Amino acid sequence: GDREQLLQRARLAEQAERYDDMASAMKAVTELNEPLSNEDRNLLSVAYKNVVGARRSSWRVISSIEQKTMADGNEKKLEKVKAYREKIEKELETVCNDVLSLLDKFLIKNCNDFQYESKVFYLKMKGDYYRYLAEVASGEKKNSVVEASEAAYKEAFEISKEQMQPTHPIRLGLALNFSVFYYEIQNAPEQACLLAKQAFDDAIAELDTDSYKDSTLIMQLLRDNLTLWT
Amino acid sequence: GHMGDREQLLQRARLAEQAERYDDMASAMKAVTELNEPLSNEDRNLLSVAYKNVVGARRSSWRVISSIEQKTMADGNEKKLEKVKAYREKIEKELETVCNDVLSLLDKFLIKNCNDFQYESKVFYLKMKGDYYRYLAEVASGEKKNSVVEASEAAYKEAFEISKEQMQPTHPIRLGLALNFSVFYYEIQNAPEQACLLAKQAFDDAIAELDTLNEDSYKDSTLIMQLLRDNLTLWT
Amino acid sequence: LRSCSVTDAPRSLSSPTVTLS
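^ Those are the sequences you sent over. The predicted structure of the assembly is below.
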């Protein structure tokens, strides 16, 4: 047991693009009950985003094949497509539940009242993984994670508005994802368009401010989504 | 019927391919092979595509970590080099299991059941046998490397003899076999001259007969031939 | 579709095994 050895394994796994190893290593680092630095937060976020992203992409492909099979009326094939979709789905939920458990027990819990940057980062992360759960759920099960997603996002947004500049990349990313939540997950395009437009306009008004590349790309993404949502 | 082992496993493999979940795809195709029935051309392609992606991810990860093992060895950090080599060995063991799984399937089912008149299947499987022994040779050392190097060459040699006597020079399987076998000479045996002769001969034999091919066969043959050409340029 | 969310941050050539799917 050694924190530095785990972080090295996380970095080695990332270079080899073995993100399950990288997520497992950063899961153990978080479980040491010691705070995560900015680099540590990046390694944890990168690892699990890649792990869940592979499940999300695989789920979307199989889900669309499931619908096409359903329309064609092929009941025998549909049962086999659904079995694979459910198998992929449970992996996705396990990944999200692992991240949410890490956040609710180690990361968010151990934040001080003055560690605003970490608190915004973790609360946004909590909204993201509840949103990923909401993507594959329906009915009362969806509403449960949808409500949890919105609650995490809003507390993060309120803290970021009070403590972060409008061109802070963390605040911009949170606004981007929070607007995505309103549009895709809960079918509120006007609410999504209003929020994306607020953050983009607020960022332009203070565009006279070293981390430009990180902030600039998210700003383009905010405009791109606004163009798509018209 | 549709509930049979073969039908369900093939359906799983096709779905796994769509989802780019190649570990699932290879495991499903491994189970299809173990049914001891011959593989169609499509099934053969699914098995080959699945394991190419599975071993290829491990090879790419191995080379990245092995490259760091070289720099960390030259830099001289024992506290770091020991853990780096441990991570690579974990990747190697995954890689060797995958290759051994393939070679077991070829030795016990695929090559075994080929009838003597199934020249296409034999060339395909023998080339695959040479391919996965070569992937073992890429990571092996000592006396272990010698045995897999000899095994790879022997599989390639028998495949190439059959392909020359049974397949036209423009056949993609023969062209792909010649390409991989010349790569074996250059990369594994460190024999550039032998590699260049094999690739050049294969390119020359094929290009003499491209003009008879139809549009679709032309695209399949020239795509492998371009790889032979690119290898020749890089080898001198 | 597919709204965008916040992003995160020679050897010899052998034969490609193209799929027929």
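DSSP finds nine helices and no strands in chain A. Residues 38-71 of chain A form the longest helix (34 residues).

Shout if you want it in another format.
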